[PDB]
């Protein structure tokens, strides 16, 4: 399990997650910390990945300097 | 030029093979 860096950037904090996991799991990971549901996640504050997308893959595609920046809030 | 022709032809077949018996639907 290669783990990579995810940056949780609130909009309106850096954690390692296994590449093998799905974005849905990352969302859930965050909800479990905030203890909410009204939380939407977006890569580089531009788009919300499908919950089934692989984090490792999202990482290789959109990582900014080793970190995969996941923005979140409670249109785009 | 020519790859497009092969694309255009395979898709044309596709549509026709997939439209076959469309009367039942």
């Amino acid at each position: 399990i290669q783990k990579i860096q995810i940056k949780f950037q609130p909009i309106g904090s850096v954690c390692k997650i296994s590449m093998s996991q799905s974005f849905a799991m990352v969302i859930l990971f965050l909800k479990r910390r905030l203890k909410m549901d009204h939380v939407y996640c977006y890569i580089n504050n531009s788009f919300a990945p499908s919950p089934q997308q692989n984090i490792g893959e999202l990482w290789m595609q959109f990582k900014t300097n080793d970190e995969l920046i996941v923005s979140y809030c409670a249109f785009g | 030029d020519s790859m497009d022709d092969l694309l255009i032809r395979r898709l044309t077949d596709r549509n026709d093979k997939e439209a076959h018996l469309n009367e039942l639907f």
Partner: protein
Amino acid sequence: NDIKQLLWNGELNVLVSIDPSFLMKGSPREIAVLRIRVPRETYLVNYMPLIWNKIKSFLSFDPLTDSEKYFWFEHNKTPIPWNYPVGVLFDCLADVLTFLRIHLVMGDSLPPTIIPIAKTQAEKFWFHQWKQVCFILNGSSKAIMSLSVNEARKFWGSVITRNFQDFIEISNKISSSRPRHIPLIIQTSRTSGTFRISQPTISMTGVNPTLKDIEGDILDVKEDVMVICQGIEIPWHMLLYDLYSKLRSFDGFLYITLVPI
């Protein structure tokens, strides 16, 4: 616009079977089975209204407040995700009759990784696909975030109204003659064997790879095969960029389905 016109016309025969749980004991046969012509470039969920209209007078429950159940499509007792182009799901599963057989199911436990149907904004999800595709092509989602609210709306509407001209106009405002990456997804058969799917990162800057050139990333999905894209066979000597710009789906992604030769 010959090729794309052919892709926009892609249409399949779909056999929709309505589980008995949805209907009332005694309802006729005709209500339980729908026969329709569904485009390749659209989502199954866009035809749910058509199914409600045909079976609403026989529902075995009040859909307004009776209880909470989940609804989803199934193929051969297996949940099917609606968030993939119909054509892509088809290639994925496939006198000789060609048709897609779908079964409507209800339950309390929503199948894992499945997004519910009838909490499911098809238009929102779709818009975001294009956002992601824009970023992969340009390194930013500005091109799509620059569309007026009207265009974004005319854009989704073209899929429902099946308006080719509008779709071609907007979808064009999101492309590149020099992309940074190729929005590519690779999958295997859901029917035969095990199912795998991936989104490899394929840089394009200063290169012009062919499927062969990146066979490494393609064959990775399932660790001689045939590359199926848009229901047709694709030559391995084909340029990735041309394949993407010509055969990409209505959600902006290029899908490749591998099948045993």
